[PDB]
Design an enzyme around this catalytic site. Structure first.
Site, PDB file in Angstrom:
ATOM      1  CE1 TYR A  88     -30.840 -15.696   9.730  1.00  0.00           C
ATOM      2  CE2 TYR A  88     -29.433 -14.736   8.029  1.00  0.00           C
ATOM      3  CZ  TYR A  88     -30.623 -15.345   8.405  1.00  0.00           C
ATOM      4  OH  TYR A  88     -31.601 -15.579   7.464  1.00  0.00           O
ATOM      5  CG  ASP A 108     -26.082 -11.678  -9.226  1.00  0.00           C
ATOM      6  OD1 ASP A 108     -25.098 -12.392  -8.963  1.00  0.00           O
ATOM      7  OD2 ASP A 108     -26.010 -10.690  -9.978  1.00  0.00           O
ATOM      8  CE  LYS A 140     -23.390  -9.049  -6.191  1.00  0.00           C
ATOM      9  NZ  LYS A 140     -24.253  -9.073  -7.401  1.00  0.00           N
ATOM     10  CG  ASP A 161     -33.272 -17.286   5.020  1.00  0.00           C
ATOM     11  OD1 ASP A 161     -33.954 -18.215   5.496  1.00  0.00           O
ATOM     12  OD2 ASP A 161     -33.736 -16.142   4.795  1.00  0.00           O
TER      13      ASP A 161
HETATM   14  C1  LIG Z   1     -21.631  -6.264 -11.050  1.00  0.00           C
HETATM   15  C2  LIG Z   1     -22.445  -5.988  -9.774  1.00  0.00           C
HETATM   16  C3  LIG Z   1     -21.725  -4.891  -8.970  1.00  0.00           C
HETATM   17  C4  LIG Z   1     -23.910  -5.550 -10.119  1.00  0.00           C
HETATM   18  C5  LIG Z   1     -24.748  -5.365  -8.832  1.00  0.00           C
HETATM   19  O1  LIG Z   1     -24.638  -6.271  -7.820  1.00  0.00           O
HETATM   20  O2  LIG Z   1     -25.803  -4.516  -8.853  1.00  0.00           O
HETATM   21  C6  LIG Z   1     -24.604  -6.589 -11.049  1.00  0.00           C
HETATM   22  O3  LIG Z   1     -24.826  -7.830 -10.376  1.00  0.00           O
HETATM   23  C7  LIG Z   1     -25.926  -6.036 -11.638  1.00  0.00           C
HETATM   24  O4  LIG Z   1     -27.117  -6.533 -11.216  1.00  0.00           O
HETATM   25  O5  LIG Z   1     -25.904  -4.919 -12.406  1.00  0.00           O
HETATM   26  C1  LIG Z   2     -37.229 -17.208  11.062  1.00  0.00           C
HETATM   27  C2  LIG Z   2     -35.840 -16.853  10.505  1.00  0.00           C
HETATM   28  C3  LIG Z   2     -35.005 -16.241  11.643  1.00  0.00           C
HETATM   29  C4  LIG Z   2     -35.126 -18.116   9.911  1.00  0.00           C
HETATM   30  C5  LIG Z   2     -33.771 -17.733   9.269  1.00  0.00           C
HETATM   31  O1  LIG Z   2     -33.680 -16.606   8.508  1.00  0.00           O
HETATM   32  O2  LIG Z   2     -32.795 -18.669   9.192  1.00  0.00           O
HETATM   33  C6  LIG Z   2     -36.023 -18.825   8.854  1.00  0.00           C
HETATM   34  O3  LIG Z   2     -36.196 -18.018   7.687  1.00  0.00           O
HETATM   35  C7  LIG Z   2     -35.471 -20.224   8.481  1.00  0.00           C
HETATM   36  O4  LIG Z   2     -34.922 -20.432   7.257  1.00  0.00           O
HETATM   37  O5  LIG Z   2     -35.339 -21.172   9.442  1.00  0.00           O
HETATM   38 MG   LIG Z   3     -26.988  -8.758 -10.653  1.00  0.00          MG
HETATM   39 MG   LIG Z   4     -35.907 -19.148   5.625  1.00  0.00          MG
END
Ligand SMILES: CC(C)[C@H](C(=O)O)[C@@H](O)C(=O)O
Ligand SMILES: CC(C)[C@H](C(=O)O)[C@@H](O)C(=O)O
Ligand SMILES: [Mg+2]
Ligand SMILES: [Mg+2]
Ligand SMILES: NC(=O)c1ccc[n+]([C@@H]2O[C@H](COP(=O)([O-])OP(=O)(O)OC[C@H]3O[C@@H](n4cnc5c(N)ncnc54)[C@H](OP(=O)(O)O)[C@@H]3O)[C@@H](O)[C@H]2O)c1
Ligand SMILES: NC(=O)c1ccc[n+]([C@@H]2O[C@H](COP(=O)([O-])OP(=O)(O)OC[C@H]3O[C@@H](n4cnc5c(N)ncnc54)[C@H](OP(=O)(O)O)[C@@H]3O)[C@@H](O)[C@H]2O)c1
EC number: 1.1.1.42
Lengths: 414, 414
Positions: free
Chosen positions: B158, B281, B228, B305
């Site tokens: 950001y 994730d 992450k 976000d």
């Molecule tokens: C282990 C990690 C590097 C990998 C990625 O972020 O793609 C995993 O989360 C997946 O989705 O296979």
């Molecule tokens: C509009 C955008 C810049 C903002 C952000 O990503 O924080 C919005 O998604 C929020 O969550 O207030």
């Molecule tokens: Mg993954």
């Molecule tokens: Mg948002």
């Protein structure tokens, strides 16, 4: 080399961008760390059964184990985490499958999963997410979820370009940004880590192209470009702009209303495919509140990683979430889940993910009949409420089965 | 200046880091673009009612409209999207609230919402997400969701540091990376957009500090650091390492088992607070499959976000998702949702979000009684099944109410 090439198998060839699969194809496979030791054996048995039953002995896979990760060190020695032959073999045999992999802490070792994808340039991370009748889900209408994720697999923040806070490199980079690029936006330049996020036109378009072609090839209703372009204008915003541009320039994308959505006519089914886009944060609410409105998803590396897990949890969890890493020369199939060392070796995790990834592999090889038997077995076993721990939760009257046990249940319902 | 300072109101002061709120405080407010024209009026009425009923006329807010966005251009003229006085006024009166804002395309105008947060250094984006009895949700047990998000609001991607593909700047930056930093990781350096992601120790720690203090102040069960880090080691990974380090160095964090989790003893309730972490994730599946296991969430800007919207959709959607931008000198309350021009001006959107943000504002000012009446009214109106469009979906027997109508329903149930 400690790899043994199967005696009675034959190598798959790629002619004119089309796979030439023998009836006795050699398929390399990586066992995987942690639970990979549990799910992989179940997958091999289920696949062998599906193939044996579908082609009554006419066809058969010649599995060839290759190494990566911990087992590779055991086989090839200390420090050999990813042998060059492993990459050589995957590219040479065209189709391979792998269990989960974990990268050790430090040692200057790069993430092994990302290394495989990037070294082989498998720019497509294909993760289909759909509901299986009888699967215990936390949502009210999992059946409304039927999407296919096309996640860019070669760029974004996954490029691995970053420097540690207070390091000489970090300071050098920060000095260049502030002094040479005149950047005044870094809130705290001291003890500040730095990461680089690249997004190219060619990387974006080869991914989106594959997504639209898949929509056309499978008569899907729409392709949604998910991005956070309002904040990252030149990367995520570029991705969305490039995606729309490709649909227009290569697929005759036509303006819908005053835009921005486009409509692409399916050359085959004559159906009009909708090309739209949604802001990433909003999309995370949309898949939960209006799932039926989404189909094929085209997104960047990081966003795809997040969407994969969020969608999977909607239809049963990561225990039933398959995937494939696809490139122009080869493909490496793998489940979305990790090595879950917590459960590792316990023969208790759900093998459905790697098994459904093998189903994708079979389909990929054109052995759709064997692929269909796996889906049938999976649906049958789950409906029989004979499932693994992850499904038992939110399952009254369900019988708990061990990992290997569930594999047998699948074969029993084929 | 076109701003009119209320005649019968008094300015709030901050003494010793503690707010000194008069009984007739002047509260600046920004109407907001799009639906802001619908929800803001409803909020003012509901707040005035809550205050009037709670302190029987003893206390009263002196609203003072200030400008930003489209209306600012109407008032101060073309190009004046964010007047300096607006920033001056928010900092001077300490507490303010705003409706949704939209930034025009191009014009070299920076995202107005992010501009407000960063210009005022409101490094905390506080977004509590909990279920309200009777709220139609897509999940089976929304009541299990009761979390508080502490989203870092001043750094991460950001920062807005990025360059357009093929631009001279982009090429200059890419040239420096490849030539001077020896980066060979950019898959396609041509027609490549570039973005910078900074994460500092001070930015991370002031956010986590606030999160732990809130956990202690409100006797929460745990603080989860979402990141992450396995892929972004020096930014997301740094954030997690810095968060754990602060819990140990400033809150006497104690190792749980062999770690990595820590336990912090609540100095007040003697309860032990759990300090853990989860990969982003995976966390997106966890909030859906094991919500009860999470409480306060500490995460970076982008991740926060995404989590904000994913959680909100779990308990009714973004129509009932409040938030606040908190800094050391002032605070700006605002709903998580946008301007939804699609519905704008239709007096149909759910005002609950900005209203619950005003409830946070009241609590913030120490007017907890007025805040309690808003919660009571909200719960009463929703239970009465007299709701807005977004709730009607997944609501049998629910009566549809207009935006202003719902506001009245809230007051009726106070
Ligand atoms: C282990 C990690 C590097 C990998 C990625 O972020 O793609 C995993 O989360 C997946 O989705 O296979
Ligand atoms: C509009 C955008 C810049 C903002 C952000 O990503 O924080 C919005 O998604 C929020 O969550 O207030
Ligand atoms: Mg993954
Ligand atoms: Mg948002
Ligand atoms: N492509 C890959 O090989 C890959 C992918 C992801 C992560 N990883 C790695 O694996 C390690 C552990 O990471 P993680 O714990 O973040 O992720 P993970 O191994 O996917 O574990 C996350 C959680 O998801 C569930 N899960 C995973 N596999 C499952 C299965 N087969 N059946 C049912 N549920 C399953 C479990 O949830 P509950 O505990 O709630 O049941 C599990 O604890 C790390 O070293 C990480 O980098 C590798
Ligand atoms: N902090 C902010 O001021 C802020 C926050 C977010 C976005 N924005 C901006 O607003 C514009 C539009 O963006 P967007 O469409 O991506 O986001 P959005 O305005 O939040 O709209 C997204 C969707 O969420 C729902 N929603 C939003 N406000 C609602 C309310 N009051 N009641 C019930 N449901 C509500 C609706 O979903 P359904 O249509 O499914 O009902 C809506 O179409 C952009 O210019 C964007 O940058 C500003």
């Amino acid at each position: 080399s400690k790899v043994v090439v199967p005696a009675q198998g034959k190598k798959i060839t790629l002619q004119n961008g089309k796979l030439n699969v023998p009836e006795n194809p050699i398929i390399p496979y990586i066992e995987g760390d942690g639970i990979g030791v549990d799910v992989t054996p179940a997958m091999l048995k289920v696949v062998d059964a599906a193939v044996e039953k579908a082609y009554k002995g006419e066809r058969k896979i010649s599995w060839m184990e290759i190494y990566t990760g911990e087992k590779s060190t055991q086989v090839y020695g200390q420090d050999v985490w990813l042998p060059a032959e492993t990459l050589d073999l995957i590219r040479e045999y065209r189709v391979a499958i792998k269990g989960p992999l974990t990268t050790p802490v430090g040692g200057g070792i790069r993430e092994l999963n990302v290394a495989l994808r990037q070294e082989l340039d498998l720019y497509i991370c294909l993760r289909p997410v759909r509901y299986y009748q009888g699967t215990p889900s936390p949502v009210k209408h999992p059946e409304l979820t039927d999407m296919v994720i096309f996640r860019e697999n070669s760029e974004d923040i996954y490029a691995g370009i970053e420097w540690k806070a207070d390091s000489a490199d970090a300071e050098k980079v920060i000095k260049f940004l502030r002094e040479e690029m005149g950047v005044k936006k870094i809130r705290f330049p001291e003890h500040c880590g730095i990461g680089i996020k690249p997004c190219s036109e060619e990387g974006t378009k080869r991914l989106v192209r594959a997504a639209i072609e898949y929509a056309i090839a499978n008569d899907r209703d729409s392709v949604t470009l998910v991005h956070k372009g309002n904040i990252m204008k030149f990367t995520e915003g570029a991705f969305k702009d490039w995606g729309y541009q490709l649909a227009r320039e290569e697929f005759g994308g036509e303006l819908i209303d005053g835009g921005p959505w486009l409509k692409v006519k399916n050359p085959n089914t004559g159906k009009e495919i909708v090309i739209k886009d949604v802001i990433a944060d909003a999309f995370l609410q949309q898949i939960l509140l209006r799932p039926a409105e989404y189909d094929v998803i085209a997104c960047m590396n990081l966003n795809g990683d997040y969407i994969s897990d969020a969608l999977a949890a909607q239809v049963g969890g990561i225990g039933i979430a398959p995937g494939a890493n696809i490139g122009d020369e080869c493909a490496l199939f793998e489940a979305t889940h990790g090595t879950a060392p917590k459960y590792a070796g316990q023969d208790k995790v759900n093998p459905g993910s790697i098994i459904l990834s093998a189903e994708m592999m079979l389909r990929h090889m054109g052995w759709t009949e064997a692929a269909d038997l796996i889906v049938k077995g999976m649906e049958g076993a789950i409906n029989a409420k004979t499932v693994t721990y992850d499904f038992e939760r939110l399952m009254d009257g369900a019988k708990l089965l061990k990992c290997s046990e569930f594999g047998d249940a699948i074969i029993e319902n084929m």
